[PDB]
Amino acid sequence: VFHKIRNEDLIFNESLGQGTFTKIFKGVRREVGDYGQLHETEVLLKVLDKAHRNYSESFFEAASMMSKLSHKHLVLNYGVCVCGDENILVQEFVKFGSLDTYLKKNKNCINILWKLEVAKQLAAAMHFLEENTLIHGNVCAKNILLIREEDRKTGNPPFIKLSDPGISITVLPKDILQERIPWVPPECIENPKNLNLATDKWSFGTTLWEICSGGDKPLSALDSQRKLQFYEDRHQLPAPKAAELANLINNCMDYEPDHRPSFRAIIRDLNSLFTPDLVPRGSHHHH
Ligand SMILES: Nc1nc(Nc2ccc3c(c2)CC[C@@H](N2CCCC2)CC3)nn1-c1cc2c(nn1)-c1ccccc1CCC2
Protein backbone atom coordinates (compact mmCIF):
# COMPACT_ATOMS: atom_id res chain seq x y z
CA VAL A 1 0.00 0.00 0.00
CA PHE A 2 1.53 3.28 -1.16
CA HIS A 3 1.15 6.34 1.02
CA LYS A 4 -1.70 8.25 -0.58
CA ILE A 5 -1.00 11.92 -1.26
CA ARG A 6 -3.97 14.16 -1.93
CA ASN A 7 -3.90 16.07 -5.21
CA GLU A 8 -4.79 19.15 -3.20
CA ASP A 9 -1.41 18.78 -1.47
CA LEU A 10 0.50 18.65 -4.79
CA ILE A 11 1.37 21.51 -7.14
CA PHE A 12 2.54 20.45 -10.63
CA ASN A 13 5.30 22.70 -12.05
CA GLU A 14 7.69 22.41 -14.98
CA SER A 15 8.14 19.39 -17.22
CA LEU A 16 11.52 17.81 -16.52
CA GLY A 17 11.51 15.33 -19.39
CA GLN A 18 10.12 11.91 -20.21
CA GLY A 19 10.77 8.20 -20.10
CA THR A 20 9.18 5.21 -21.81
CA PHE A 21 5.44 5.75 -21.54
CA THR A 22 5.99 8.41 -18.85
CA LYS A 23 6.38 12.16 -18.31
CA ILE A 24 8.08 13.75 -15.31
CA PHE A 25 7.37 17.10 -13.66
CA LYS A 26 8.83 19.07 -10.81
CA GLY A 27 6.31 19.52 -8.04
CA VAL A 28 5.80 20.90 -4.56
CA ARG A 29 4.23 18.72 -1.90
CA ARG A 30 2.55 20.21 1.17
CA GLU A 31 2.62 17.84 4.07
CA VAL A 32 2.51 17.60 7.84
CA GLY A 33 6.03 16.58 8.68
CA ASP A 34 7.94 15.61 11.76
CA TYR A 35 6.64 17.38 14.84
CA GLY A 36 3.40 18.34 13.11
CA GLN A 37 5.12 21.14 11.24
CA LEU A 38 3.70 22.05 7.84
CA HIS A 39 6.47 21.81 5.26
CA GLU A 40 6.91 22.18 1.53
CA THR A 41 9.22 19.71 -0.23
CA GLU A 42 10.36 19.54 -3.81
CA VAL A 43 9.13 16.32 -5.42
CA LEU A 44 9.37 14.45 -8.70
CA LEU A 45 5.99 13.68 -10.17
CA LYS A 46 6.07 10.77 -12.62
CA VAL A 47 2.93 10.41 -14.73
CA LEU A 48 2.09 7.33 -16.76
CA ASP A 49 1.16 8.51 -20.30
CA LYS A 50 -2.57 8.40 -21.04
CA ALA A 51 -1.79 6.38 -24.17
CA HIS A 52 -0.14 3.68 -22.00
CA ARG A 53 -2.50 3.26 -19.04
CA ASN A 54 -2.73 -0.48 -19.67
CA TYR A 55 0.74 -0.72 -18.08
CA SER A 56 -0.40 0.90 -14.82
CA GLU A 57 0.05 -2.29 -12.78
CA SER A 58 3.66 -2.81 -13.93
CA PHE A 59 4.30 0.94 -13.51
CA PHE A 60 3.29 0.86 -9.83
CA GLU A 61 4.79 -2.57 -9.07
CA ALA A 62 8.19 -1.42 -10.40
CA ALA A 63 8.16 1.59 -8.10
CA SER A 64 7.04 -0.61 -5.19
CA MET A 65 10.38 -2.47 -5.53
CA MET A 66 12.04 0.70 -4.24
CA SER A 67 9.52 1.12 -1.44
CA LYS A 68 10.53 -2.31 -0.09
CA LEU A 69 14.25 -1.55 -0.26
CA SER A 70 16.17 1.18 1.52
CA HIS A 71 19.65 1.99 0.27
CA LYS A 72 21.69 5.17 -0.01
CA HIS A 73 22.05 4.72 -3.79
CA LEU A 74 18.33 4.11 -4.54
CA VAL A 75 15.75 6.86 -5.20
CA LEU A 76 13.13 7.31 -2.50
CA ASN A 77 9.40 6.98 -3.08
CA TYR A 78 7.03 9.25 -1.15
CA GLY A 79 3.66 7.88 -2.34
CA VAL A 80 1.00 8.00 -5.05
CA CYS A 81 -1.40 10.82 -5.92
CA VAL A 82 -5.17 10.34 -5.82
CA CYS A 83 -5.06 12.40 -9.02
CA GLY A 84 -8.39 11.29 -10.45
CA ASP A 85 -7.87 9.38 -13.68
CA GLU A 86 -4.07 9.79 -13.55
CA ASN A 87 -1.52 7.23 -12.37
CA ILE A 88 1.08 9.44 -10.66
CA LEU A 89 4.04 8.52 -8.45
CA VAL A 90 5.52 11.06 -6.02
CA GLN A 91 9.26 10.50 -5.66
CA GLU A 92 12.45 12.13 -4.53
CA PHE A 93 13.53 15.06 -6.62
CA VAL A 94 17.25 14.61 -7.39
CA LYS A 95 18.79 18.03 -7.79
CA PHE A 96 21.06 17.71 -10.80
CA GLY A 97 18.91 15.37 -12.92
CA SER A 98 19.87 12.49 -15.14
CA LEU A 99 23.44 11.37 -15.71
CA ASP A 100 23.19 11.13 -19.48
CA THR A 101 22.29 14.84 -19.75
CA TYR A 102 24.94 15.73 -17.20
CA LEU A 103 27.70 13.77 -18.96
CA LYS A 104 26.90 15.53 -22.23
CA LYS A 105 26.84 19.04 -20.75
CA ASN A 106 30.00 18.50 -18.66
CA LYS A 107 31.97 16.15 -20.92
CA ASN A 108 34.85 18.65 -20.88
CA CYS A 109 35.24 18.89 -17.09
CA ILE A 110 34.70 15.24 -16.03
CA ASN A 111 37.91 13.28 -15.38
CA ILE A 112 38.58 9.58 -14.99
CA LEU A 113 38.20 9.54 -11.20
CA TRP A 114 34.74 11.09 -11.54
CA LYS A 115 33.77 8.34 -13.96
CA LEU A 116 35.25 5.62 -11.73
CA GLU A 117 33.40 6.99 -8.69
CA VAL A 118 30.04 7.02 -10.45
CA ALA A 119 30.61 3.59 -11.89
CA LYS A 120 31.60 2.19 -8.47
CA GLN A 121 28.53 3.72 -6.87
CA LEU A 122 26.28 2.21 -9.53
CA ALA A 123 28.03 -1.13 -9.05
CA ALA A 124 27.41 -0.86 -5.32
CA ALA A 125 23.70 -0.35 -5.87
CA MET A 126 23.67 -3.27 -8.28
CA HIS A 127 25.56 -5.52 -5.87
CA PHE A 128 22.88 -4.71 -3.28
CA LEU A 129 20.17 -5.70 -5.72
CA GLU A 130 22.09 -8.82 -6.70
CA GLU A 131 22.43 -9.87 -3.06
CA ASN A 132 18.67 -9.38 -2.69
CA THR A 133 18.09 -11.44 -5.90
CA LEU A 134 16.22 -8.53 -7.41
CA ILE A 135 16.32 -7.66 -11.10
CA HIS A 136 16.17 -3.99 -12.09
CA GLY A 137 15.82 -4.48 -15.82
CA ASN A 138 16.28 -0.87 -16.96
CA VAL A 139 19.83 0.16 -15.97
CA CYS A 140 20.88 3.14 -18.16
CA ALA A 141 22.45 6.54 -17.66
CA LYS A 142 19.05 8.27 -17.96
CA ASN A 143 17.92 6.35 -14.87
CA ILE A 144 20.95 7.41 -12.85
CA LEU A 145 20.39 10.71 -11.03
CA LEU A 146 23.05 13.06 -9.68
CA ILE A 147 22.41 14.10 -6.03
CA ARG A 148 25.57 16.18 -5.67
CA GLU A 149 28.35 17.32 -7.90
CA GLU A 150 32.04 16.68 -7.26
CA ASP A 151 33.50 19.29 -4.87
CA ARG A 152 36.95 20.14 -6.19
CA LYS A 153 37.41 22.40 -3.15
CA THR A 154 37.62 19.35 -0.86
CA GLY A 155 38.05 16.35 -3.18
CA ASN A 156 34.64 15.01 -2.28
CA PRO A 157 33.18 12.87 -5.09
CA PRO A 158 29.89 13.12 -6.92
CA PHE A 159 27.00 11.08 -5.51
CA ILE A 160 24.38 9.22 -7.57
CA LYS A 161 21.20 7.25 -7.12
CA LEU A 162 19.51 4.69 -9.37
CA SER A 163 15.82 5.13 -10.11
CA ASP A 164 13.03 2.55 -10.08
CA PRO A 165 13.08 0.45 -13.28
CA GLY A 166 9.81 1.55 -14.74
CA ILE A 167 7.61 -0.74 -16.76
CA SER A 168 9.16 -4.20 -17.05
CA ILE A 169 10.61 -5.37 -20.34
CA THR A 170 8.61 -8.55 -19.67
CA VAL A 171 5.41 -6.73 -20.71
CA LEU A 172 6.77 -4.31 -23.33
CA PRO A 173 6.24 -4.52 -27.11
CA LYS A 174 8.96 -6.07 -29.26
CA ASP A 175 9.27 -2.80 -31.19
CA ILE A 176 10.10 -1.04 -27.92
CA LEU A 177 12.65 -3.68 -26.92
CA GLN A 178 14.42 -3.43 -30.28
CA GLU A 179 14.79 0.32 -29.82
CA ARG A 180 16.35 -0.36 -26.40
CA ILE A 181 19.32 -2.23 -27.98
CA PRO A 182 22.06 -2.28 -26.68
CA TRP A 183 20.73 -1.82 -23.12
CA VAL A 184 18.41 -4.84 -23.39
CA PRO A 185 20.65 -7.93 -23.76
CA PRO A 186 20.41 -10.16 -26.87
CA GLU A 187 18.63 -13.02 -25.07
CA CYS A 188 15.82 -10.71 -23.91
CA ILE A 189 14.74 -9.36 -27.30
CA GLU A 190 12.69 -12.36 -28.44
CA ASN A 191 12.06 -13.73 -24.91
CA PRO A 192 12.05 -10.89 -22.36
CA LYS A 193 10.41 -13.19 -19.81
CA ASN A 194 13.67 -15.09 -19.52
CA LEU A 195 15.32 -12.09 -17.81
CA ASN A 196 17.48 -12.91 -14.78
CA LEU A 197 20.24 -11.29 -12.73
CA ALA A 198 22.57 -11.60 -15.72
CA THR A 199 20.34 -9.16 -17.58
CA ASP A 200 21.49 -6.28 -15.38
CA LYS A 201 25.16 -7.15 -15.85
CA TRP A 202 24.82 -6.55 -19.61
CA SER A 203 22.95 -3.28 -19.09
CA PHE A 204 25.57 -2.18 -16.58
CA GLY A 205 28.16 -2.61 -19.29
CA THR A 206 26.14 -0.43 -21.66
CA THR A 207 25.71 2.19 -18.93
CA LEU A 208 29.44 2.17 -18.20
CA TRP A 209 29.91 2.80 -21.93
CA GLU A 210 27.61 5.82 -21.62
CA ILE A 211 29.64 7.10 -18.67
CA CYS A 212 32.88 6.77 -20.65
CA SER A 213 31.49 8.34 -23.84
CA GLY A 214 30.31 11.67 -22.50
CA GLY A 215 26.67 10.70 -22.71
CA ASP A 216 26.68 9.49 -26.31
CA LYS A 217 23.94 6.95 -27.03
CA PRO A 218 25.55 3.72 -28.28
CA LEU A 219 24.38 2.59 -31.69
CA SER A 220 22.08 5.64 -32.09
CA ALA A 221 22.97 5.84 -35.79
CA LEU A 222 21.59 2.32 -36.32
CA ASP A 223 17.90 1.87 -37.05
CA SER A 224 16.02 -0.96 -35.35
CA GLN A 225 16.84 -3.44 -38.12
CA ARG A 226 20.55 -2.68 -37.92
CA LYS A 227 20.44 -2.82 -34.09
CA LEU A 228 19.06 -6.37 -34.36
CA GLN A 229 21.74 -7.23 -36.92
CA PHE A 230 24.43 -5.91 -34.53
CA TYR A 231 23.38 -8.67 -32.10
CA GLU A 232 23.09 -11.24 -34.93
CA ASP A 233 26.71 -10.48 -35.85
CA ARG A 234 27.91 -10.62 -32.22
CA HIS A 235 29.45 -7.20 -32.27
CA GLN A 236 30.73 -5.27 -29.22
CA LEU A 237 30.53 -1.54 -28.62
CA PRO A 238 33.44 0.65 -29.68
CA ALA A 239 36.10 0.78 -27.04
CA PRO A 240 36.51 3.90 -24.94
CA LYS A 241 40.08 5.17 -24.82
CA ALA A 242 40.37 3.97 -21.19
CA ALA A 243 41.38 0.44 -22.11
CA GLU A 244 40.73 -1.15 -18.72
CA LEU A 245 37.19 0.25 -18.75
CA ALA A 246 36.68 -0.99 -22.33
CA ASN A 247 37.68 -4.40 -21.02
CA LEU A 248 35.13 -4.19 -18.19
CA ILE A 249 32.39 -3.03 -20.56
CA ASN A 250 33.05 -5.94 -22.86
CA ASN A 251 33.31 -8.47 -20.02
CA CYS A 252 29.90 -7.37 -18.79
CA MET A 253 28.41 -7.33 -22.33
CA ASP A 254 29.12 -11.04 -22.78
CA TYR A 255 26.79 -12.73 -25.23
CA GLU A 256 26.87 -15.75 -22.88
CA PRO A 257 24.73 -14.62 -19.92
CA ASP A 258 26.21 -17.19 -17.53
CA HIS A 259 29.70 -15.81 -18.10
CA ARG A 260 28.95 -12.25 -17.12
CA PRO A 261 30.81 -11.37 -13.92
CA SER A 262 29.31 -10.91 -10.50
CA PHE A 263 28.88 -7.37 -9.18
CA ARG A 264 31.42 -8.27 -6.45
CA ALA A 265 33.97 -8.94 -9.22
CA ILE A 266 32.93 -5.79 -11.08
CA ILE A 267 33.52 -3.74 -7.93
CA ARG A 268 36.92 -5.37 -7.48
CA ASP A 269 37.93 -4.43 -11.04
CA LEU A 270 36.75 -0.87 -10.58
CA ASN A 271 38.49 -0.50 -7.22
CA SER A 272 41.77 -1.62 -8.72
CA LEU A 273 41.61 1.17 -11.30
CA PHE A 274 41.67 3.89 -8.62
CA THR A 275 45.33 3.08 -7.92
CA PRO A 276 47.59 4.49 -10.65
CA ASP A 277 49.80 1.99 -12.48
CA LEU A 278 53.05 3.77 -13.29
CA VAL A 279 54.78 0.69 -14.76
CA PRO A 280 54.61 0.82 -18.58
CA ARG A 281 52.21 -1.71 -20.07
CA GLY A 282 54.00 -4.77 -21.41
CA SER A 283 57.14 -4.49 -19.25
CA HIS A 284 57.29 -8.27 -18.77
CA HIS A 285 59.17 -8.35 -22.10
CA HIS A 286 62.41 -6.51 -22.92
CA HIS A 287 61.60 -4.94 -26.31
N1 LIG B 1 13.94 11.14 -9.36
C1 LIG B 1 14.29 12.15 -10.29
N2 LIG B 1 14.73 13.34 -9.96
C2 LIG B 1 14.98 13.95 -11.16
N3 LIG B 1 15.48 15.31 -11.24
C3 LIG B 1 15.66 16.11 -12.37
C4 LIG B 1 15.27 15.71 -13.66
C5 LIG B 1 15.53 16.61 -14.72
C6 LIG B 1 16.12 17.89 -14.47
C7 LIG B 1 16.48 18.29 -13.21
C8 LIG B 1 16.28 17.39 -12.13
C9 LIG B 1 17.16 19.64 -12.83
C10 LIG B 1 18.48 19.80 -13.46
C11 LIG B 1 18.51 20.28 -14.96
N4 LIG B 1 19.70 20.58 -15.27
C12 LIG B 1 19.86 20.79 -16.48
C13 LIG B 1 21.19 21.65 -16.54
C14 LIG B 1 21.09 22.45 -15.33
C15 LIG B 1 20.16 21.94 -14.60
C16 LIG B 1 17.89 19.02 -15.88
C17 LIG B 1 16.37 18.76 -15.70
N5 LIG B 1 14.73 13.14 -12.20
N6 LIG B 1 14.29 12.03 -11.67
C18 LIG B 1 13.89 10.89 -12.43
C19 LIG B 1 14.13 10.95 -13.81
C20 LIG B 1 13.64 9.79 -14.55
C21 LIG B 1 13.03 8.78 -13.86
N7 LIG B 1 12.83 8.82 -12.48
N8 LIG B 1 13.29 9.85 -11.76
C22 LIG B 1 12.48 7.59 -14.50
C23 LIG B 1 12.70 6.33 -13.89
C24 LIG B 1 12.14 5.22 -14.51
C25 LIG B 1 11.38 5.35 -15.70
C26 LIG B 1 11.13 6.58 -16.24
C27 LIG B 1 11.71 7.71 -15.66
C28 LIG B 1 11.39 9.12 -16.24
C29 LIG B 1 12.61 9.85 -16.81
C30 LIG B 1 13.86 9.64 -16.05
Curated annotation (Swiss-Prot):
UniProt site positions, description: Breakpoint for translocation to form PCM1-JAK2 fusion protein: D175, I176
Residue ranges annotated for the Protein kinase domain, each copy included: 10-274
Tissue specificity comment: Ubiquitously expressed throughout most tissues.
Subcellular location field: Endomembrane system; Cytoplasm; Nucleus
Post-translational modification: Autophosphorylated, leading to regulate its activity. Also phosphorylated by TEC. Phosphorylated on tyrosine residues in response to interferon gamma signaling. Phosphorylated on tyrosine residues in response to a signaling cascade that is activated by increased cellular retinol. Undergoes Notch-induced ubiquitination and subsequent proteasomal degradation which is mediated by ASB1 or ASB2, the substrate-recognition components of probable ECS E3 ubiquitin-protein ligase complexes.
Family designation: Belongs to the protein kinase superfamily. Tyr protein kinase family. JAK subfamily.
Assembly behavior: Interacts with EPOR, LYN, SIRPA, SH2B1 and TEC. Interacts with IL23R. Interacts with SKB1. Interacts with STAM2. Interacts with IFNGR2 (via intracellular domain). Interacts with LEPR (Isoform B). Interacts with HSP90AB1; promotes functional activation in a heat shock-dependent manner. Interacts with STRA6. Interacts with RHEX; this interaction occurs in a erythropoietin (EPO)-dependent manner. Interacts with ASB2; the interaction targets JAK2 for Notch-induced proteasomal degradation. Interacts with MPL/TPOR.
Function per UniProt: Non-receptor tyrosine kinase involved in various processes such as cell growth, development, differentiation or histone modifications. Mediates essential signaling events in both innate and adaptive immunity. In the cytoplasm, plays a pivotal role in signal transduction via its association with type I receptors such as growth hormone (GHR), prolactin (PRLR), leptin (LEPR), erythropoietin (EPOR), thrombopoietin receptor (MPL/TPOR); or type II receptors including IFN-alpha, IFN-beta, IFN-gamma and multiple interleukins.
Protein name: Tyrosine-protein kinase JAK2
Species for this entry: Homo sapiens (Human)
Source species taxonomy: Eukaryota, Metazoa, Chordata, Craniata, Vertebrata
